[PDB]
Nucleic acid binder design. Structure first.
Ligand SMILES: [Mg+2]
Ligand SMILES: [Mg+2]
Ligand SMILES: [Mg+2]
Ligand SMILES: [Mg+2]
Ligand SMILES: [Mg+2]
Ligand SMILES: [Mg+2]
Ligand SMILES: [Mg+2]
Ligand SMILES: [Mg+2]
Ligand SMILES: [Mg+2]
Ligand SMILES: [Mg+2]
Ligand SMILES: [Mg+2]
Ligand SMILES: [Mg+2]
Lengths: 141, 179, 55, 125
RNA sequence: CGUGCCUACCAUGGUGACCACGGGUGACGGGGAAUCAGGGUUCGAUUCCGGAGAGGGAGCCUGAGAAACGGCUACCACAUCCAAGGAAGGCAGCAGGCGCGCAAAUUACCCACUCCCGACCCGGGGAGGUAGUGACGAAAAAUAACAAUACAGGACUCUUUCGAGGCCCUGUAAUUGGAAUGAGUCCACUUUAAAUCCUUUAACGAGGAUCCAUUGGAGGGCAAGUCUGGUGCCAGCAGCCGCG
């Protein structure tokens, strides 16, 4: 079914170069919509300042009220629904604080419990959330 | 701009599967048998043995009368004899591939100390080779990861030291306590 | 939602326990010595049908 | 106590000098300083001690040999001429007396701004 | 200097489905780097070669070599001192400052080494070298160890041994040493243009108040608890299945 002659390498590179676009990973890696569509400008982390604190509902088999921080960016200016990771930290994240955000496990999908949140809170005003969830490095007053 | 040095070798192999029960048991009994600190210095010996195996298979790929094969094979046999893994008997290139991991660990410093005395419990021989008490030759040896070459293999002395060399490094504390 | 301020409930209602004085932990070469001597010298009387590494 | 020997030896009769590599053996105390090795090498060469220079000293990690480079000369005028001023500074034959930063560059600037009699007035004083 | 590089005339030509022409590149081109059957895939701004540029872009003197910018002239956008008539500027150099961003070093010393410029053995060089921050990353590696006495939890040689232990792992907050050596406290060396750091040596320098090893996990993948007490689809955990 293939083409296997000694002068067919142009036909091969043309056919594979056409069929290589049908993979999701190649087109999301080499098409500009993964720069001009997502936030971060194609980055891993970005600062942001809190707009509001919204509780979202979880999925159907898991009944939980997840806590989320609507983040106004500094670089791009988009509105990002983040996620407060740990048990407390809602009392530690106040209104209009500098918040560093990241991903969960994948840029494309989200966590199977939270419906529409791709992003996760890392820092609270240049002091990280792991210290605030532990006992050291309390916030400035 | 600057021109000093830019080179980087990683004598360090992390295996693909991180958690294998039989392999972790083998590595733990290997460390407990040959007196080591962590598994990165097991992986050093694994990487050196694997590099020797890759070079040996690259030599065995070529034809028998090839000059590069003859030169590099004779040099590799000479280097393995000067290390002390092989003998002066079988000089076959597949006899290089017929080697295990424990041969270089036997040809380390403190295992040759265990074979030729003054070791006294390898876990104490770690301290005996960290502190200046076991000295292969006039150039002082301090580092545990040291390959004992077969050319001398016996010059294990120590001079100007605590048990035989002399001096009062810390027995002056006990003598001032008794005085 | 109205119940948004249910935060830190478990860490506010969980009773604290004082961490008691634990001895120092031997590390590195000593830790590998005790890991070898925990499961490679005096375990083979207990036969390998049943396993008891933690209980 | 100590033992001073040579390893490599060269002779440059163009400059009337003899170069050598010096190993000093130590089964005992610490690294012997600049003065005593120079005095013992002057005694072994059987001339005046104010002519032999030496530089560099290593240590082979506990006793052993210490390695350096020794310059044995025969003429003190050739010693003052051929040796650089930084190796005259070990005995204090050359002194600069102003080892300060930006003095040369600020004199260049004050001679770059004004020109002539005012330049000779400000830049020299 | 050969050239449609330019000019006058004449002919209508030249390229292309073997991708011409036009667009985008978060495209400087390579030697190379990462990735371990082989074939491949992705980067390469970056120390070496070559090219381009000195906010954009045009013109030019000198000079063999420049359309140079730590050279000049004019325009646009900035921007300094004015006593308001005029002057003076280009850190994508070395430090450093502002902004930007998740993101990156000190207004240090020296021409001592390497070479480079100049009339010259003699001057100079933020080119460079040394030092400071530095867990980008790489190499070696103690972290409390070890050989001793004894209660033995007792596996093992073998004799009714309810043990003779010249083999033994281990809890020993039980004792004794090399009182080791290492980190730090620091004389004198040494290195160095002057120092610092590597190493050497003099005196100090451990017995759980030690001189303190953390980072994640313990349902399967994936190593490890059907331990205890609260929380009771709430908090939450979990990258996937799932638990509450
Ligand atoms: Mg996912
Ligand atoms: Mg570009
Ligand atoms: Mg590879
Ligand atoms: Mg390949
Ligand atoms: Mg060209
Ligand atoms: Mg240019
Ligand atoms: Mg220039
Ligand atoms: Mg400039
Ligand atoms: Mg600029
Ligand atoms: Mg956890
Ligand atoms: Mg398991
Ligand atoms: Mg996780």
């Amino acid at each position: 079914g293939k083409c296997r002659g000694l002068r067919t390498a142009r036909k091969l590179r043309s056919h594979r170069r056409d069929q290589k676009w049908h993979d999701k990973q190649y087109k999301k890696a080499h098409l500009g919509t993964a720069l001009k569509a997502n936030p971060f400008g194609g980055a891993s982390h970005a600062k942001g300042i809190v707009l509001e604190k919204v509780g979202v509902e979880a999925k159907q088999p898991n009944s939980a009220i997840r806590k989320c921080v609507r983040v106004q960016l500094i670089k791009n200016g988009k509105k990002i629904t983040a996620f407060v990771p740990n048990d407390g930290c809602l009392n530690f994240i106040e209104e209009n604080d500098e918040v560093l955000v990241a991903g969960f496990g994948r840029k494309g999908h989200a966590v199977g419990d939270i419906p529409g949140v791709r992003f996760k809170v890392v820092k609270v005003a240049n002091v990280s959330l792991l210290a605030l969830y532990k006992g050291k490095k309390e916030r400035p007053r | 701009p600057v021109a000093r040095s830019w080179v980087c070798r990683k004598t360090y192999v992390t295996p693909r599967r991180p958690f294998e029960k039989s392999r972790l048991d083998q590595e733990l009994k290997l460390i407990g048998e040959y007196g080591l600190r962590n598994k990165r210095e097991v992986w050093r010996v694994k990487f050196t043995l694997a590099k020797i195996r890759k070079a040996a298979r690259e030599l065995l790929t070529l034809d028998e009368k090839d000059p590069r094969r003859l030169f590099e094979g004779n040099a590799l046999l000479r280097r393995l004899v000067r290390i002390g893994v092989l003998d002066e008997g079988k000089m076959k290139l597949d006899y290089i591939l017929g080697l295990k991991i424990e041969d270089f660990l036997e040809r380390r410093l403190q295992t040759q100390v265990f074979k030729l005395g003054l070791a006294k419990s390898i876990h104490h021989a770690r301290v005996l080779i960290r502190q200046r008490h076991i000295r292969v030759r006039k150039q002082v040896v301090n580092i545990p990861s040291f390959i004992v070459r077969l050319d001398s293999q016996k010059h294990i002395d120590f001079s100007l030291r605590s048990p035989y060399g002399g001096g009062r490094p810390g027995r002056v504390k006990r003598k001032n306590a008794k005085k | 939602h109205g119940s948004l301020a249910r935060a830190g409930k478990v860490r506010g209602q969980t009773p604290k326990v004082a961490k008691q004085e634990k001895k120092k932990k031997k590390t590195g070469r000593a830790k590998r010595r005790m890991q070898y001597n925990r499961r490679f010298v005096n375990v083979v009387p207990t036969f390998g049908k049943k396993k008891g590494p933690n209980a | 106590t100590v033992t001073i020997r040579t390893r490599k030896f060269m002779t440059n009769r163009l400059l009337q000098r003899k170069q050598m590599v010096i190993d000093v053996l130590h089964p005992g105390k610490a690294t012997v300083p600049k003065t005593e090795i120079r005095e013992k090498l002057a005694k072994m060469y059987k001339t005046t001690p104010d002519v032999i220079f030496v530089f560099g000293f290593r240590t082979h990690f506990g006793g052993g040999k210490t390695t350096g480079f020794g310059m044995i000369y025969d003429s003190l005028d050739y010693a003052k001429k051929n040796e650089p001023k930084h190796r005259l500074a070990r005995h204090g034959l050359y002194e600069k007396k102003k080892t300060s930063r930006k003095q040369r560059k600020e004199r260049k600037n004050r001679m770059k701004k004004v020109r002539g009699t005012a330049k000779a007035n400000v830049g020299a004083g």
